[PDB]
Amino acid sequence: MKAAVVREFGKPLTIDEVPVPEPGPGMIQVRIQASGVCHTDLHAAEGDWPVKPNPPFIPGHEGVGFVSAVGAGVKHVKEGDRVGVPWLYTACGHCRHCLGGWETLCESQLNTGYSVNGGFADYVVADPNYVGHLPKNVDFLDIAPVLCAGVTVYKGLKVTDTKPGDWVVISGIGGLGHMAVQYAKAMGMNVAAVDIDDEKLALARKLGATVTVNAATEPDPAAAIRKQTDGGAQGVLVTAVGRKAFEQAIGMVARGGTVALNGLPPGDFPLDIFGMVLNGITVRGSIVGTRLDLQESLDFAGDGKVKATVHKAKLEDINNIFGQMHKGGRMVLDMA
Template sequence: MRAAVVTSFTEPLQLQDRPVPTPGPGQVLVRIETSGLCHTDIHAAHGDWPVKPSPPFVPGHEGVGIVEATGPGVTAHEVGDRVALPWLGHACGHCDHCVSGWETLCVRQQNTGYSIDGSFADYAVADANYAVRVPDGVDPLDAAPLTCAGVTTYKAVKVAHIRPAEKVAIFGIGGLGHLALQYAHLVGGEVIAVDVSDEKLGLARDLGADHTVNAATEDPVSAIEALGGADVAIVLAVIPSVFEQAFASLRRGGRLVCVGLPPEQDGPMKLPLFPTVLKGISVIGSIVGTRQDLAEVFDLHALGRTRVIAETRSLEDVNSAIDEVLEGRAPARLVFEM
């Protein structure tokens, strides 16, 4: 089978011919149909974060495909099922986080395309209990971005506890942001889309954004203050200064939801303590959603409540696709179609 492999943090991915893996106990073998390219895959390939994966490995955690074989003891899926392989590839299932509905905080978790081989390949094996069924009617091309970009931003909107008519600023309109603004709109938020690209801001308006701010041509803090300030700011960018702008745009009692993860070398975000305390600001870290969150994301899409903006690429073009994302040329999500 073909697989795009990280052999070094300083070298492009290599397209290799590997044996088709065999599912072990509790695992399924999935023939990959589509796999989205997430910025996290790029961070993984470059070793950007403090806890680094170990080359060689196969990235990809937005994989969607068909179960071709099951290992011993599998009851969650059958051959022929279409499933998604999300970031949370495995958790212990027994700790207080797992049993309380916060499996994404499990300290024993394994992550698809990071600590275990992912979906930038023709086939992948996965823990059957953490492969999420894709409902009939959800196209694999749409399901791939929903598997991470969708569930991550859906969870961010959930933990923000947005009330109808609150102003919600989305910083970064791309693979994640174009979905975040739709979820914020669904729960009744007045959505402010912030980006440096007129093209992406045009997309935001098409998807229902109430206001747009081009941070390349105007100060986003002043622009959002002129609208009354944001009740919630969800940051999907990976630049520390953007987090600081989002914080400054909040009105009293506002909530800053941190989603994007800048490379380690870019330094920390500066958090001013006096405004945080005196204005009653909440700073919330939001990690990816659970299996239940992803099931809800798929159900919403099947109901026609969300649109996925994506373009397909070939796995052979994995390195040029990474360049597109890093240079901001990707319209929203890029998806490898096997």
């Protein structure tokens, strides 16, 4: 097998040859055919997060492919199913979160490519109770970003308490941003995109955004959004969480609205507690959703209502991709 192993933090990933994993009880083995590249993989490679991985680990939580083995205890998943290995790898199974349909909040959970070896390889051992099952009518390259970006933005839009026909701003139309635009349009929600570029605003207009505001050349983007979204978006999905981005997001959401945050920035953002209380503003965090959310997002991608603009790549240029993310659609490694 060939992987991209973070042997020591900070130093660039080296394309080594590591042994082929083999599944244990209730464990399947996936033959990766695509593997999305996310900024969470960059932060796992560098290691600048409170709780860190123990290198050498293989990153990547967007690996999709075939089941090439079942570890002799697996009941449902067959050998040939189109599966993927998302962020959530396992869970305890008995805590209040695992029992309430909220296993992403489990405190003993593992994370693919963070606490266990991930998608940046040919074969991965995964847990069949947590893998996502993929629709047939979608190729692996266009379904890999949905395993972390699609589910993240779908759950983020679900936690804004927004219904169809309500205004949701998608802030920072990147890869996650364009995926979120597609999901928000597929849910009946009016969309108002806000980014710093104008080509991305054109892309959002193509994707069903009826409102666009340039967050870099408008006098105040929040006033523009409140003008066009009938007095403030009912939900704001902040996709790339930065400063003046969280600020404009707080300014754009209408009273009683919800600011879902789908990024993991560093530092401590200021929060106008007075304004949040006076406006009844909810601010909620959400990293990639649960198994039901993943399944529903894969079903949105099986109807051709959400498509991921993907730039194919081999394994050997992963470093460059991280370089491209260090400076600043979606980069899917091509294992097929």
